[PDB]
Amino acid sequence: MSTYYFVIVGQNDNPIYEKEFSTVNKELRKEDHRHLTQFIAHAALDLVDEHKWKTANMQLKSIDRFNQWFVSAFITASQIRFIIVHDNKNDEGIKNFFNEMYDTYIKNSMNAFYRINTPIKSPMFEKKSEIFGRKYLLS
């Protein structure tokens, strides 16, 4: 199968949120995935910042490929760093998946109570993300 990992990064490099869909097993190793990739999102970011200074493309499909960890970047106008990291490729899912992530993010970013670079606990957003994952990633 494919592994599933989403991350949300504030402008101030704050990891706002992270979402998972992989078949549940060895939860300690899934947390290892989390920090592995959250700290991979570190050089990925130190890289993708100049990459975004190069191209203002819709979405930076590939930033690094660790030969088992894959870096896909959809950076926002507010520079919100977004990365999907997976052991397997699925480009068509990920492109418009980051699209729909961005969309529901706009929806839940409008609310005045949110302030820049802040974790968002809205389980409505959780189920919106889950529906997207079942649409564009999971089967």
């Binding site: 402008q11 975004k52 200074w53 203002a56 493309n57 819709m58 950076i75 926002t76 106008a77 507010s78 520079q79 919100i80 961005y102 969309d103 993010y105 706009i106 970013s109 409008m110 005045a112 949110y114 302030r115 820049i116």
Partner: protein, 164 residues
Amino acid sequence: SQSIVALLFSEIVQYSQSRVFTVPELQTRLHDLGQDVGTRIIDLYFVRERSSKRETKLTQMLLFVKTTVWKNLFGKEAEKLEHANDDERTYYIIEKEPLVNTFISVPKDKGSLNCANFTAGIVEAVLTNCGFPCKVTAHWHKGTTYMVKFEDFVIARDKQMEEK
């Protein structure tokens, strides 16, 4: 209405003028409100009205974000743009229309600065969220005018990518 927004904004200014003691911190509070506006409008208009595609380069983003923000705020782009050689950090964005005068303005004795700073606050929000930390001053020179002090790392960064 026009006048409902003018009224709600008069209550803005008055709430500040209440729980704020002196003018410059009142302008600071206006600037905070402006940051609040920008913080979400910029992400909105990345897609719908900005060709859905990101733009990074300085002057293009300056002018185009100027225009798109003004179209979806008042539908009136800023009348001119000056970027000053004598200080490459010093750019001026100037709009003859003050957002303030929806209600025509304040006493002309106590507060030299006005909503002009609150609009400057929205400006600062969008710039710094695009990737352009900057400080903005509102001056009553040639009507409502502004001046932007970009970020040093940013100023070096684009000064370097002046070429490809």
